Amino acid sequence: HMNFKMEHQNKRSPLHAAAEAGHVDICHMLVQAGANIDTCSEDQRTPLMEAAENNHLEAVKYLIKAGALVDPKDAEGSTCLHLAAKKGHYEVVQYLLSNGQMDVNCQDDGGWTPMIWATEYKHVDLVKLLLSKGSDINIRDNEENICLHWAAFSGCVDIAEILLAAKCDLHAVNIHGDSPLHIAARENRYDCVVLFLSRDSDVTLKNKEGETPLQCASLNSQVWSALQMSKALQDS
Template sequence: MSSLNEGLIDAASRGDLEEVRRLLDKGADVNAKSEYGGTPLHWAAARGYLDIVKLLVDRGADISARDVDGETPLHRAAANGHLDVVEFLLDRGADVNAKDEVGGTPLHWAAAWGHLDIVKLLVDRGADINAKDEDGETPLHWAADNGRLDVVEFLLDRGADVNAKDIYGWTPLHLAAYYGRLDIVKLLLDRGADVNAKNGGGKTPLDLAREKKYWDIVNFLEKAVEDAENILETKISGTSVMATVVKSEG
């Protein structure tokens, strides 16, 4: 890599707007890539340097460039919580549903890191709320896994599948129980999560909570399982009574 291009990447990563402009004027490649595939735009987006992001895009930076992990500048801005950069990139045509090497979208990453403002923006701009990564996990899985209660609530409000299963049969409730997220366990159940769902190993969220010794979650889930069984018994009993009535009337 030429010294000009190295200097451009360094200046973009440091937030030195004037140096970025000077190097571009001297002929540095606006789409030069570092050892791991990051362009100046990747670095500026990741660090939240909006003025540099704008300059690079105006000078022809590839808004869809991928690094070695398959991440676009939008992925990096979303993961690092830079709302203004995310909005600018979307306005300039960035793919809101681009997937990286593990199948993660910008929404997955914003959800995982708890950037609710960015999650809202991405969804409003057409992000697939039930997009699945290579393991079959949705943004709701990532948010539940990482304990992002406000993000979980928003995603559910906007139609996320509360019982979505990954390729191993894990639902968001399995993850919340496994990682000790009691507040999220409560919210998911309140929104219709199946307390008796079994993963690929035949384990329920309660089984996982017991294994991890999260006794507060165990106690809560035991009560939820009992309530679910009572509801089922009531439905079965009601169906039997109705069948008897219909038969006697017939």
């Protein structure tokens, strides 16, 4: 078949289905026969986003070593980088970084960077990787949260340990004036609230409601216990 020349096509193409399948040859045949390697689907997605998100490394490379644009954004501002990382695909994220020469700090619509995405889905090795390749731990999403806050909200200590070992501010506070410890308490993330207290997080720090992390924990929670034990140990 023939390919219409289009300015801004907004319809899924066969190239999309082929990229998503990870079928390199069919991709090539299509590219070769004139298919636009960067066509957008109804929901504004490129064949590269499709290959990336489905962990199809060889298809990713083909598309890239073919001129595929690496910076277009999703309907919600996500790049193939956000998508692959959000799915925890190490290799694809690796390539998208080196040969891909893509930005580790691009933020989607809600302000989230790839590291924040990899943190939401507790992909430890991925945050390691993203760090070792330039992630700005100080990036603030659209509500003032930095990566530590979500690491706290989620509960993944391994990622939070790592974000700290990276000189991340233990007292950074979001729009509500919540610190990592404030969140780790509200969400009852024990191991987390412990790592934090072990790093001298201010237990007396109030937020914009005047609550201290101890006042945010639920009563008689593993966390509440550990946070008061702590207050008492200080007061004395």
